[PDB]
Amino acid sequence: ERPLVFLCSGCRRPLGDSLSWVASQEDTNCILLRCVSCNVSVDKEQKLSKREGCVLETLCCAGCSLNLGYVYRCTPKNLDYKRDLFCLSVEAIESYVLGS
Amino acid sequence: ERPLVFLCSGCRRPLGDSLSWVASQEDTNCILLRCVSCNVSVDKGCVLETLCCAGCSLNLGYVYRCTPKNLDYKRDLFCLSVEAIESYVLGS
Ligand SMILES: [Zn+2]
Ligand SMILES: [Zn+2]
């Protein structure tokens, strides 16, 4: 195929690429990355989950402090696969596609 | 192996990527790209118009338009100054 780079919406810093893109979520409109760049920082405050409850710290761009998503830190057995993966909101990243 | 994405030193807009890279050893301060993104705006002894960034105006490089035989490779390629771009490598 052709790989992607994900850029912060608020300032265009590189957040990650499709090489670490493991999975997606249709309802939360997030993509799940195994691996992120130095520009995704982790607000060290554990907040509870408000959906179908996990513990998860929120992600934001080291550059402009835009809210980028969340990481699952603590999860029940059924959600262990999402644990430690970076969920990036689609409404907060912009894709650049390689190949012109 | 893994590809690169080149980006404007000034506003981080994407310029182009290593998929278009032209391996040259003649020039020592420019990356040669066979094609570039919408963000590389071309504006206004070789004739060569100047490249700059469509978002922020930063002088980015140049394009050799008229060349002699020995420079025919550089012709119509976008030379991005490595002092005016940055790169993100995929897999990081
Ligand atoms: Zn940002
Ligand atoms: Zn720029």
Author numbering:
A (entry chain A): 78 to 129, 133 to 180
B (entry chain B): 78 to 121, 133 to 180
Show passages lifted from the paper.
To preserve centromere identity, CENP-A levels must be maintained through active CENP-A loading during the cell cycle. A central player mediating this process is the Mis18 complex (Mis18α, Mis18ý and Mis18BP1), which recruits the CENP-A specific chaperone HJURP to centromeres for CENP-A deposition. The Mis18 proteins, Mis18α and Mis18ý, possess a well-conserved globular domain called the Yippee domain (also known as the MeDiY domain; spanning residues 77-180 in Mis18α and 73-176 in Mis18ý) and C-terminal α-helices (residues 196-233 in Mis18α and 191-229 in Mis18ý). Here, using a multi-pronged approach, we characterise the structure of the Mis18 complex and show that multiple hetero- and homo-oligomeric interfaces facilitate the hetero-octameric Mis18 complex assembly composed of 4 Mis18α, 2 Mis18ý and 2 Mis18BP1.
To determine the structure of human Mis18 Yippee domains, we purified and crystalised Mis18α_Yippee_ (residues 77-190). The crystals diffracted X-rays to about 3 Å resolution, and the structure was determined using the molecular replacement method. The overall fold of the Mis18α_Yippee_ is remarkably similar to the previously determined *S. pombe* Mis18_Yippee_ homo-dimer structure. In brief, the monomeric Mis18α_Yippee_ is formed by two antiparallel ý-sheets that are held together by a Zn^2+^ ion coordinated via loops containing C-X-X-C motifs. The Mis18α_Yippee_ dimerisation is mediated via a back-to-back arrangement of a ‘three-stranded’ ý-sheet from each monomer. As observed for Mis18α_Yippee_ homo-dimer, the Mis18α/ý Yippee hetero-dimerisation is also mediated via the back-to-back arrangement of the three-stranded beta sheets of Mis18α and Mis18ý Yippee domains. The integrative model of the Mis18 complex fits well in the EM map. Interestingly, the serial arrangement of the Yippee domains utilises the second Yippee dimerisation interface observed in the crystal packing of both human Mis18α Yippee and *S. pombe* Mis18 Yippee (**Fig. S3d, highlighted by zoom in view**).
